[model samples]
Target: MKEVTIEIKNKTGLHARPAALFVQTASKFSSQIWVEKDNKKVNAKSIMGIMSLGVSQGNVVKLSAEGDDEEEAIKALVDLIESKFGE
Candidate 1:
C-alpha cells in the first residue's frame, strides 16, 4: 500500500464537481484507493463516500492505494488534489 497526506486548497473543497472529478480520476486506476479524514476512511472512487467526509478547503486528508499501479495511482491523485482540482 502507498499513502500520502494532502491539504485541500480548493475554495469549495471536494463536493459536487470536485468530488466528481476526484471520483473520476480515482476510477481510472485499477488499484484500490481510499481517502481518510478524521479517522474515517472511504472509497476514493465513490462520490458518495468522498462527500460523506465533508472535506473543505484547508482540510487535511490521507490518500492510500494498494495494487500493481499503487504508486501511479497515488501520484495522480496527489497531483489532482494539489492542483486544487483545477478550481
Candidate 2:
C-alpha cells in the first residue's frame, strides 16, 4: 500500500465537480483507493463516498491505495489534488 497526505487548494474543495474529477481519476487505477479525513475513510472511486467526507479547502486528507499500481495511483491522485483539480 501507498499513502500520502494532501491539502486541498481549490476554493471549492472536493465537491461536485472536483469530487467528480477525483472519482474519475481514481477509476482509471486498478488499485484500491481510499480517502481519509477526520478518522473517516471512503472509497476514492465512489462519488457519494467522497462527497460524504465534506472535504474543503485547506483540509488535509489522507490518500491510500493498495494494488500492483499502488505507487502510480497515489502519485497520480496526489498530482491531481496538487493541480487544484484544474480549477
Candidate 3:
C-alpha cells in the first residue's frame, strides 16, 4: 500500500461536483481505494463517505490505495488533486 497526502486547494472542497469527479476517476482503478481525514478512513468511490470527510481548502488529506493497480491509482488521483481538479 502507498499513501499520499495533499492539501485541498479548491474553495468548495470535495462537495457535490468535486466528489462526483473524484469518484468517477477512482472507478477507473481496480484497487481498494480509501481516503483519510481526522482519523477516519472512507472509500474514495463512495460519495456519502467522502462527503462525510468534510475536506476543505487548506486541509491535508491522506489517500491510500491497495491492490495490483494501487500505485497507478495513486498517481492518477494525486495528479487530479494537484491540478485542483481542473477541466
Candidate 4:
C-alpha cells in the first residue's frame, strides 16, 4: 500500500466532472483505490463516495491504493491530482 496527500486546485473542486474523471481513471487499474479526508475514507472508484467528501480548492486529501498494482495506482492518481486533473 502507498499513500499521498494532494491539494485540489480547481475552483469548483472535485465536482461531478472531476469526480467522474477520477473514478474513470481509478477504475482502469485492478488495484483497490481509496481517498481520505478528515479521517474519513471512501472508495476512489465511486462517484458518490468522492462527492461525499465535498472537496474544494485547497482541500488536502490522501489517496491510497493496494493490490497487485498498488504502486502504479497511487503514482498515477497522485500525478493526476498534481496536474489538477487538467483544470
Highest lDDT model number: 2
Q: Rate the local accuracy (lDDT) of all candidates.
A: 0.92, 0.93, 0.90, 0.85
Return whichever of 3 and 4 wins on TM-score. Answer: 3
**Model 2 global lDDT (CA atoms, 0 to 1):** 0.93
Where model 2 places Cα greater than 4 Å from the true spot, the runs are none
Where does candidate 2 have its weakest 10-residue lDDT segment? 78-87
Q: Give candidates' CA RMSD values in order.
A: 0.9, 0.7, 0.9, 1.1
Models sorted by lDDT, best on top: 2, 1, 3, 4
Query: What lDDT, from 0 to 1, does candidate 4 have?
Result: 0.85
Candidate with better TM-score, 1 vs 4: 1
Q: Please provide, for model 2 over 15-71, each residue's C-alpha lDDT reduced to its tens digit, 9 standing for 90 to 100.
A: 988889999999999999999999999999999898899999999999999999999
lDDT of 3 at 72: 93
Query: What is the per-residue lDDT of model 4 for residues 1-87, given as tens digits with 9 covering 90 to 100?
Result: 888888888776778677788888899899999998999899999888998888888899999998899888888887777787875
Candidate 3 lDDT at 25 equals 89
Clash total of candidate 1 = 0
lDDT of 3: 0.90
Candidate 2 residue pairs in clash (backbone atoms < 3 Å): none
